[PDB]
Design a binder for this molecule. Sequence first.
Ligand SMILES: CCC(=O)OCC(O)(O)CCO[C@@H]1O[C@H](CO)[C@@H](O)[C@H](O)[C@H]1O
Ligand SMILES: *[C@@H]1O[C@H](CO)[C@@H](O)[C@H](O)[C@H]1NC(C)=O
Length: 400
Amino acid sequence: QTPDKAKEQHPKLETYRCTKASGCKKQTNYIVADAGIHGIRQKNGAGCGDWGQKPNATACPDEASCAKNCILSGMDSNAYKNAGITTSGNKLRLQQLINNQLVSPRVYLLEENKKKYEMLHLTGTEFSFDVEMEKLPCGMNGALYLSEMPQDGGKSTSRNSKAGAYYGAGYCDAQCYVTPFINGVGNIKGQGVCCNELDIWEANSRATHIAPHPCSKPGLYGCTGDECGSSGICDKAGCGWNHNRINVTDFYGRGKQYKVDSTRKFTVTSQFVANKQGDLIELHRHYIQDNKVIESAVVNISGPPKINFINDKYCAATGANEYMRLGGTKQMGDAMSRGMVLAMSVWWSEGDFMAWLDQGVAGPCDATEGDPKNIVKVQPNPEVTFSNIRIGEIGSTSSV
Ligand SMILES: CCC(=O)OCC(O)(O)CCO[C@@H]1O[C@H](CO)[C@@H](O)[C@H](O)[C@H]1O
Ligand SMILES: *[C@@H]1O[C@H](CO)[C@@H](O)[C@H](O)[C@H]1NC(C)=O
């Protein structure tokens, strides 16, 4: 699409860079809503296409026409607020609903100059963040993850591509979903929009999940036919880590009965260990709450290696067959080393109700409480706050 001339006012977010030698130094970053949350429209008000499909055929018969007819609207600070997105010092608040309107934001982290996504190179390094989960019931997903999005939002791939990173274009993930726009241009051939994805955090107050999703094509790839499916170029399922699934059901939850109490603030630390050739070999996690380090628990079922972190062996032993076929942890690390965009979002699901996150072997939610119509009766205004984001050397981003 073509951005209009309204003033874009990206919420400021302070983040930190850390070294064992000198501590953590503050720096200024900016937050951007997804291109589609800005509002993409024809001049008569019709949309330029729904999620899951090619762009409207009459506004977008080809790429040049799509860019002419599909206008993206600038977002001022009120627009951000009404989109459920606000910041304060090092905090980012994401709200699911504003005045009974579903807003379910998804945002990206911008460098200080605002023209580029702050690309993160996490293989060999550590990432820490604090989070407040109290207001997310069964069926919700408050998410922190990375995707291998183009830093410029797709601008250099086409003279028709105008939005860039300034307007939040170029989103991709390992689900290879068909979106109306791709690389800031109309998705004329209806290709699935793919890229390597690192799900650091996917959660509600009842269950948490971690999942690397490697893909066999580097950067953002437009898939067709069998490329987009279950035997395709991307690992849809991911290689998952959920305490409930490895039978440690008292690790994470609401209240004093859990080692990590989801009703009060806590720190999440992720360490991406590499070997001497610079390949990622394992993903670790620990927590800090009330000033005390809390270690992740060992696998408590038979089969998988008795460890508390992710590696290829664990993934093969827990059935992550597409993950191993597509290159496994190494392939994940290769995308992490090239650089990836940080994304933060809040959402729910009308189909499966997020059952894979928090039902049956994944957690304590029944079959229907996580339906959006029941979610709002447990918590009228589901929201999540991510803050204090610190990146850098292993051992330097958090501590007691
Ligand atoms: C490699 C990273 C990867 O695949 O990450 C992506 C995900 O795992 O979070 C998959 C879900 O993403 C969520 O999908 C729904 C549509 O289903 C959106 O409305 C939310 O904004 C979005 O964050
Ligand atoms: C596609 O755009 C055309 C033209 O403006 C409009 O007539 C049509 O109704 C649109 N389709 C949808 C589903 O909005």
